Amino acid sequence: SLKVVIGYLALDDWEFESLFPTIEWKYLTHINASFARVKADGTLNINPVRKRIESVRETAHKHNVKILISLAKNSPGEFTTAINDPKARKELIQQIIAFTKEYKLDGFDIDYEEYDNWDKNFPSLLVFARGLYLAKEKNMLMTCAVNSRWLNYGTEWEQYFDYINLMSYDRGAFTDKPVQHASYDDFVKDLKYWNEQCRASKSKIVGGLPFYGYSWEESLQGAVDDVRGIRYSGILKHLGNEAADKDNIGKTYYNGRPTIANKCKFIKENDYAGVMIWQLFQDAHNDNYDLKLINVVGREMMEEGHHHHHH
């Protein structure tokens, strides 16, 4: 039960060409290649990953890191349509298992985020999850990216997944008011929710970590996206290296090194499965190597507990 470090890798990220060669594989156990998009008819839009999936797979495997294909909605409501429609649902299940097998991947990750009428659609989602599990091959890993506390997943969902990755971030971030989107408090409560309420074994609960934040600084409007999002790399660039050891400077809130470490430590101290990251490319660049968040994760998850004699 060694800790896992599941890193999301967006194969269509604008920084791919420049940053792919710098991925710190020694601090990863798995990578989720994102995303194969789910269409309403149960088929997949693999344009975001088709051209790079094979190369990433070979590179990951060469470094002894597993690779899974992550699946998200093609557009608003398409994933919901796919699972509520019986034939589409069965098609989607086949598509997923096929893609995984064909591309010789280590498994698949389900990132379902259709929040409209959540409880009404959940039974169908659960049926989809069970069907996926029953249809998958033995060796295939099956994981999911999930919310905690504000959405109910019940107590049956748990059983079908090898890893349940908590998206403990983006809380209260979509308003005109500055706030910490991924607090330590909410991370701890999210974990407790999944172990105690969803009855998921701690050995499969994975705490999600953000390598980005949000800024409400007027002066940074030219450095944040449509939702005020800004990568850790952009934070250090615009706010200076002192930002690496804080969660906030002015009206910019994110997860700095101390907090990333504190989250990893809680995972370790309370026997959780490990951590997940969204997303690897948002980390600092080699010009700020020593300040990278992945290294904080590496020190806490691979080294702090790995020490042995006869070095």
Automatic annotation (TrEMBL):
Residues 3-303 form the GH18 domain. It catalyses: Random endo-hydrolysis of N-acetyl-beta-D-glucosaminide (1->4)-beta-linkages in chitin and chitodextrins. The keyword Signal applies. Gene3D superfamilies: (Trans)glycosidases - domain 2, Glycosidases. It holds the Pfam family Glyco_hydro_18. Keywords: Glycosidase, Hydrolase, Signal. SMART domains: Glyco_18. Its EC number is 3.2.1.14. InterPro entries: Chitinase_II/V-like_cat (IPR011583), GH (IPR017853), Glyco_hydro18_cat (IPR001223), Glyco_hydro_18_chit_AS (IPR001579), Glycosyl_Hydrlase_18 (IPR050314). GO terms for molecular function: chitin binding; endochitinase activity. GO terms for biological process: carbohydrate metabolic process. Transmembrane segments: none annotated. Belongs to the glycosyl hydrolase 18 family. This is chitinase. It comes from Bacteroides thetaiotaomicron (strain ATCC 29148 / DSM 2079 / JCM 5827 / CCUG 10774 / NCTC 10582 / VPI-5482 / E50). The lineage of its organism: Bacteria, Pseudomonadati, Bacteroidota, Bacteroidia, Bacteroidales.
